[PDB]
Write a protein that binds this ligand. Sequence first.
Ligand SMILES: [Pd+2]
Ligand SMILES: [Pd+2]
Ligand SMILES: [Pd+2]
Ligand SMILES: [Pd+2]
Ligand SMILES: [Pd+2]
Lengths: 171, 171, 171, 171, 171
Amino acid sequence: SQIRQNYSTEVEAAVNRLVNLYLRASYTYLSLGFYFDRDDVALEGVAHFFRELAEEKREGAERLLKMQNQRGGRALFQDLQKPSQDEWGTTLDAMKAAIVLEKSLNQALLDLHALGSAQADPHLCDFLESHFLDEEVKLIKKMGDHLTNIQRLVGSQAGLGEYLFERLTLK
Amino acid sequence: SQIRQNYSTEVEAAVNRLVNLYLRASYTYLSLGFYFDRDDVALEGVAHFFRELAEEKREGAERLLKMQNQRGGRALFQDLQKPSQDEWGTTLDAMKAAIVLEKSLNQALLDLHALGSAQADPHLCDFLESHFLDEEVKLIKKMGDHLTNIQRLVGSQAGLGEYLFERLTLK
Amino acid sequence: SQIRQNYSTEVEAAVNRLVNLYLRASYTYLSLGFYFDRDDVALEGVAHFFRELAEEKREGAERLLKMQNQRGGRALFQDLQKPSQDEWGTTLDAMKAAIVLEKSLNQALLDLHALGSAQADPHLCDFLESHFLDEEVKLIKKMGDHLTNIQRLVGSQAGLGEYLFERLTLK
Amino acid sequence: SQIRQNYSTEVEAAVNRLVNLYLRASYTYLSLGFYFDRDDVALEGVAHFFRELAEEKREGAERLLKMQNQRGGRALFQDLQKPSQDEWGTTLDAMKAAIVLEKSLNQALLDLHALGSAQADPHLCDFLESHFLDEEVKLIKKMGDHLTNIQRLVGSQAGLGEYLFERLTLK
Amino acid sequence: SQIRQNYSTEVEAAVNRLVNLYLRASYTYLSLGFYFDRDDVALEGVAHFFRELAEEKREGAERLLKMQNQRGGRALFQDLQKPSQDEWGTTLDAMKAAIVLEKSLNQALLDLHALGSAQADPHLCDFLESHFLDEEVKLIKKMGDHLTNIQRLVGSQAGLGEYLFERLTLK
Ligand SMILES: [Pd+2]
Ligand SMILES: [Pd+2]
Ligand SMILES: [Pd+2]
Ligand SMILES: [Pd+2]
Ligand SMILES: [Pd+2]
């Protein structure tokens, strides 16, 4: 590289790790998306919600990789761990798992921003805010809103509430 | 016929039987369709679902008959057995009966494809795949999805669940 | 599942393995795509070629997963092995690696088709032909065409030939 | 025939021979066209050039046959000799072979025109000029132009020159 | 000024210096742009590339001056040093000089951002990121990409490579 400037080896490594985290998250959402498409689950709005998230996280990884090259860093890929579950339970179980996942990505972004601040790397810190940190806050708020509505619908008839949420809130 | 080539008498007979099965299935769906239009049943989305299926199965029979003539075989019609029930119970009962019916048609198609493979009749085997086997897989998946949603809606208030499914999923 | 019919456990497992192979191939093409975007490589047409392939292979995996659910099988994900190289050499080296990769996917599809034929599963065999086997033949022919043109351009001035191929054949 | 007038048996026979020559030329160009589409040759602009010529020569034969009937002569077909080569070498080799072929067709047209002049058959002589002799002069000039550019591109790097000609002059 | 708030004399002075650096860079690119328009150089795509950069850097200076006034600081102009060379050598020489120039501007922006961070001036730091630091990263990546392609084209025939790069990559 003849372009690298103010781009630390620590940040370069952390960016590669964040790419792996984003790709893992995409893979997790892919699994969630197909689980809700199972004939014995059959909640299309829920499937669509997670399938859209799979694509968003893949896009996030690609944006990070583009930035790595723009800065003169070098992409290094690692194995992608399979998702933590094969079956994801109820919509409530899935939304809880999704919020946990998003909080972990958000924390990884915050950790990287902190490293950028420590390294005096303003291009990095601003890139993370613009493309990632703002989107995370919005997504987490939406999931929290969803969790609240799912929870209020459990009542004594969980099946009815699960159907209604998918029909009236999602897709 | 001056056109028949590679078209066995076994396949010709099996095609005629499949026509009868398709016409029977259309007749069954016609009965289902009008049952759900009864003033004391009154589930329009369910009626429409079965009425559409009646037309699809009739169309399938006509396609088989066209193919029979294209191959130089001769259509032979048999009596059409009246449907197995006069009254079809709940939406759940009806969807269960519809899945059973579709699985029987699918098995008849698979049996015919096997005969085509045994007879080295690739035009037949491909015709069945293109117009029938793919459609069956899609339809059966949709019915399974429907059954799952119907089942989750039973709860303690079957009437409420039946109304909601018709209103929010169907027609 | 209340829909599964004529869908063997052997095929279901093989479909899950093929999904992993497609996702691995997508990951490989993602790496190839970003390698050619490096400031010290800088062959945009080559990067774009591999980035498009990454998306095609991801789409292929998603189609396989949709089919798995349509048949009543259950998606099971495994770890995704990181790509075989971190740096991909010349356009020629990369195109050779891509052809090798495509031949491996093609062989996996052929192996699965053979299993489908052995299991008398015509829906599976036709699905593979329509969405995968035809596309593979076309893609492999295109890569072979590319390899030939790359090879004729090496001459005594490899740099010149590499630039011209990217400029005049690709993107 | 109740229409034949001023149309000699010599011309009628020569027209049938010219049809055979045109059909042979079409067959030759068909072979050339597919040779350049081989994955180990892969020069699309060259393939397209010869494929277009195959269609032009076929069209020429059909025009001659229409004229034969317009004059009250009778089409008589002979075997079509397979093309002189199975593999056509370089673009230069192929263009040289194509010019040789065109000169032979041009000479056959000139020989027929001479026969028409000898037989005082002005409809024939004008038909040949309008549909064939003018087109031949234009095509031969274009091939000569191509040969010159191909030849100047050989240099010390034949592969580079062959690629550039296909990319920058053809299709 | 009745508007100045949180705007240090150190930042105000540094902004004036950055204006001078931007105007100097514009002047350098103006010289580069006209050099490549010389009849004995005659590389229009290269001239256009540098002429566009001259305008971009002038625009950058004007944006800085507008910001200085928005904050209540006072523009102070200094002499503009003539560019470091009268003749710029090859496209490769020029692109190397341009990357050096951009890295110096980028470092000046980073130094100013650091001063803004030290002075707790978030309006300044964000202004620099938005209008300057992001653009610099993109421009430097593009120049690095260009340098790589120029370098691969040198081979044994520098003239040929220089012509091809101007024709096929630039303007
Ligand atoms: Pd920061
Ligand atoms: Pd078959
Ligand atoms: Pd098959
Ligand atoms: Pd004449
Ligand atoms: Pd700041």
